[PDB]
């Protein structure tokens, strides 16, 4: 069961925060090698000098690909699975899958890295966002009551009516920098940046396609008139 | 899991070298404060079993049971590692190596397994690095490079990683880590 996330690719600030998160917490193991720092800066509105100073940690040039020092074979040996390139991961898995996966890490001592994932069971990825999210466990917490889709909110306060469930992802209090909403926004910005990276032509594609479709409607009007006429 | 409350009492003997709270004053002794409980327990077990050789600890852990070690590790993990200061002449190179690694030489950045802030991953056993003494960090990197320390497992994560670090790289990255937070 995935969680929906409304990802706005026109939000430059969100994509910038996601790019910062990716450059700091993610490029240690994951590459974005099909994507250049120069294009990322141009599309996110980041000045080239700012991109160089803040997001390029590997000594690469602005026009270089987002390569990392960790080789896939070395990382496969170390983690048991190679950390895949994340340029297209939004297209491979979708944004909802990524949003649910990055928020579904929970402590699991039976696992090599002490964590497991609800979305990706027995994943070989360590919980690298634990400092932000905090300790997440499969414990008992309050969940909104639902009966055959009969979802109960509080009529007055508008907040959910909850009952205890004992197989839920609960963040241990005072264990991470960000609360649930702040970590939700962090993961949303990261997934927004990943969605941009997978499909950097989306906005331009929509604009060009709108113009193309307008032209094709015009041309269809003319071709239809030239057909129905001349068929008399 | 260990008990930090009892570990505090059990960790008094250790505080002679590592400090009462685990923040050692001498550079050659590592800071145990704020270190991952899993990593601390693994290191203590390795030193007990000879998988890691610390001559200064000869026989100090033999009399401590598994629960005592767990309690001590929990107590030290419940503290906060103090942050040192990086050498200005070395901070640039050390920061570049830590955050970026070496694309050409294929050396990973340290920010993946050890957090960008150097706090490590406690659940995964990746040790906290930020604030650790530059001397100790340099010694550990040299030991990994030369194979002196091999308790990082069969995968030889840190042996392989440190094989790609020069002495200047080791010094710079240790200095950067000393001030990392």
């Amino acid at each position: 069961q995935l969680d929906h996330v409304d990802i706005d690719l026109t939000d430059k600030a969100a994509m910038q925060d996601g790019a910062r998160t990716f450059a700091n917490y993610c490029m240690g193991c994951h590459s974005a090698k099909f994507q250049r720092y120069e294009r990322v800066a141009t599309d996110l509105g980041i000045p080239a000098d700012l991109m160089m100073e803040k997001l390029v940690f590997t000594g690469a040039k602005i026009g270089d690909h987002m390569d990392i020092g960790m080789k896939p074979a070395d990382a496969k040996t170390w983690f048991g699975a190679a950390p895949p390139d994340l340029t297209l991961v939004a297209r491979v898995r979708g944004t909802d899958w990524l949003y649910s996966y990055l928020r579904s890490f929970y402590e699991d001592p039976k696992r090599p890295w002490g964590v497991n994932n609800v979305i990706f069971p027995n994943v070989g990825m360590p919980n690298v966002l634990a400092p932000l999210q905090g300790r997440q466990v499969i414990g008992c917490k309050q969940v909104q009551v639902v009966e055959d889709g009969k979802k109960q909110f509080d009529p007055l306060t508008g907040t959910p009516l909850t009952h205890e469930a004992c197989d839920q992802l609960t963040v241990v209090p005072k264990t991470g920098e960000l609360n649930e909403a702040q970590f939700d926004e962090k993961v949303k910005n990261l997934v927004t940046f990943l969605a941009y990276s997978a499909n950097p032509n989306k906005l331009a594609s929509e604009r060009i396609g709108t113009y193309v479709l307008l032209y094709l409607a015009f041309f269809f009007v003319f071709a239809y008139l030239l057909k129905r006429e001349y068929w008399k | 899991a260990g008990d930090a409350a009892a570990g505090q009492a059990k960790a008094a003997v250790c505080g002679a070298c590592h400090g009462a709270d685990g923040n050692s004053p001498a550079p050659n002794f590592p800071k145990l404060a704020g270190q991952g409980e899993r990593y601390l327990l693994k290191q203590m077990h390795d030193i007990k079993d000879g998988k890691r050789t610390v001559l200064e600890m000869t026989g100090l852990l033999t009399n401590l049971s598994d629960q005592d070690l767990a309690d001590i590790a929990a107590y030290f993990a419940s503290q906060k590692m103090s942050v040192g200061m990086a050498d200005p002449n070395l901070v640039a190179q050390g920061e570049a190596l830590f955050r970026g690694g070496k694309i050409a030489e294929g050396m990973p950045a340290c920010t993946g397994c050890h957090s960008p802030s150097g706090v490590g991953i406690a659940t995964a056993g990746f040790p906290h690095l930020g604030g650790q003494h530059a001397t100790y960090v340099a010694k550990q990197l040299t030991d990994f490079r030369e194979g002196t320390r091999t308790n990082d497992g069969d995968t030889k994560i840190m042996q392989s990683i440190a094989a790609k670090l020069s002495n200047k790289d080791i010094a710079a990255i240790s200095s950067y880590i000393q001030g990392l937070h």
Partner: peptide, 16 residues
């Protein structure tokens, strides 16, 4: 605004 948004996570304390 962008610079603050893009600040690297790792902070290093340097002598002087």
């Amino acid at each position: 605004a962008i610079a603050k948004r893009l600040e690297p996570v790792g902070k290093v304390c340097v002598q002087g």
